[PDB]
Amino acid sequence: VETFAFQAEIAQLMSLIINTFYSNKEIFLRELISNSSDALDKIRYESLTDPSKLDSGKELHINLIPNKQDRTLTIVDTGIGMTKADLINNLGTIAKSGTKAFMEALQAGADISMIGQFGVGFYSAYLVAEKVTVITKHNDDEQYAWESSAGGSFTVRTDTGEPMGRGTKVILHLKEDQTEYLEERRIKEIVKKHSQFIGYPITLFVEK
Numbered sequence: 001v002e003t004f005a006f007q008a009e010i011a012q013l014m015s016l017i018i019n020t021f022y023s024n025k026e027i028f029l030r031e032l033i034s035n036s037s038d039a040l041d042k043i044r045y046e047s048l049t050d051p052s053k054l055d056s057g058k059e060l061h062i063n064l065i066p067n068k069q070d071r072t073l074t075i076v077d078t079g080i081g082m083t084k085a086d087l088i089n090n091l092g093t094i095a096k097s098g099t100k101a102f103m104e105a106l107q108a109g110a111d112i113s114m115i116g117q118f119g120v121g122f123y124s125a126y127l128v129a130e131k132v133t134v135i136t137k138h139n140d141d142e143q144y145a146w147e148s149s150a151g152g153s154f155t156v157r158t159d160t161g162e163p164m165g166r167g168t169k170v171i172l173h174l175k176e177d178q179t180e181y182l183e184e185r186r187i188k189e190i191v192k193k194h195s196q197f198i199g200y201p202i203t204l205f206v207e208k
């Protein structure tokens with residue numbers, strides 16, 4: 001297991017997200033679904049010039065999986081996935097400019113719901129999650145698990161669990177007072193409201 005420090009600016013964003021009083025927390029789900037949809041668009045487009053990129057799975061979809069026993073909500077896609085370099089460096093590097101503009105917009109009147117307009121909506125996960133685990137598989141790399149409970153650091157390890165073929169699973173370990181996002185009716189409400197026009201089938205799994 002390798003442990004890394006977030007860039008100062010990303011650490012600052014995450015603390016803002018964790019510490020700021022802001023009741024409209026449901027926006028995290030829209031942001032993660034939007035990210036999944038962008039990742040599905042990417043693999044679809046790449047597959048037009050190299051059909052073999054779909055050898056790791058033809059199905060292009062999003063699954064939402066609540067689990068009350070583990071207190072987790074998982075967002076799963078069969079999109080392009082992320083490489084080790086994406087997890088450790090590339091995505092954070094790109095998020096730096098968006099983060100700066102976002103925190104400038106907040107002290108100038110914007111609110112946290114606009115986070116996705118700055119390309120850094122992934123970090124809205126920390127509105128509801130005390131820990132985020134991301135399991136991911138890109139065609140050009142191995143399966144990895146990224147994980148962070150914030151506080152300035154994250155880990156990356158090669159993942160030994162079940163192979164996923166290609167795509168990304170974002171596992172939200174929910175805060176004690178955010179278990180409403182495990183309820184079927186609440187999830188349905190949020191998806192209908194914010195994600196009605198996404199172009200991939202979204203399947204909300206039911207609990208056993």
Ligand SMILES: Cc1nnc(Cl)c2ccccc12
Pocket residue numbers: 035086087091092095120122134146
């Ligand atoms: C910036 C960013 N966006 N999406 C995901 Cl899934 C990320 C995962 C790890 C680190 C940064 C991410």
Ligand SMILES: [Mg+2]
Pocket residue numbers: 005006007010092093
């Ligand atoms: Mg970083």
